[PDB]
């Protein structure tokens, strides 16, 4: 009965949860941990991933 | 600067180490060109060491 109520609360939910879900991915680099990037690399070819 | 051995690329932006840490040091961006050239033939003097 109370559907579609609950459509926009999914829908938002599933919005900021896929949000989040794509900070723990990197996008062709070594890892998506910025803290394992400074400290695994040089400084200048630091900021190239 | 006389630097020699395998430390000439240390000589760029970043790439730290022995040579390029304690006694020169380019910055990240370094806006133009490093010039190194062998000069065993001038320098043999292991007197003036």
């Known amino acids: ?3 579609k109520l609950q459509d926009v609360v999914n829908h938002n939910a599933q919005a900021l949860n896929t949000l989040v879900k794509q900070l723990s991915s990197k996008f062709g680099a070594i890892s998506s941990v910025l803290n394992d ?3 695994r690399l040089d400084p ?3 900021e190239v991933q | ?3 020699r ?3 000439v690329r240390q000589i760029a932006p970043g ?3 022995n040579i390029a840490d304690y006694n ?3 910055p990240d961006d370094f806006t133009g060109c490093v010039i190194a050239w062998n000069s065993n033939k001038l ?3 292991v007197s003036g060491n």
């Open chain 2, 24 to 26: 020169y040091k380019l």
């Open chain 2, 15 to 17: 790439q730290t180490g």
């Open chain 1, 1 to 3: 009965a109370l559907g």
């Open chain 1, 44 to 46: 200048p070819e630091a």
């Open chain 1, 37 to 39: 990037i400074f400290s």
């Open chain 2, 43 to 45: 320098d043999s003097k």
């Open chain 2, 1 to 3: 600067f006389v630097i």
């Open chain 2, 5 to 7: 051995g395998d430390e």
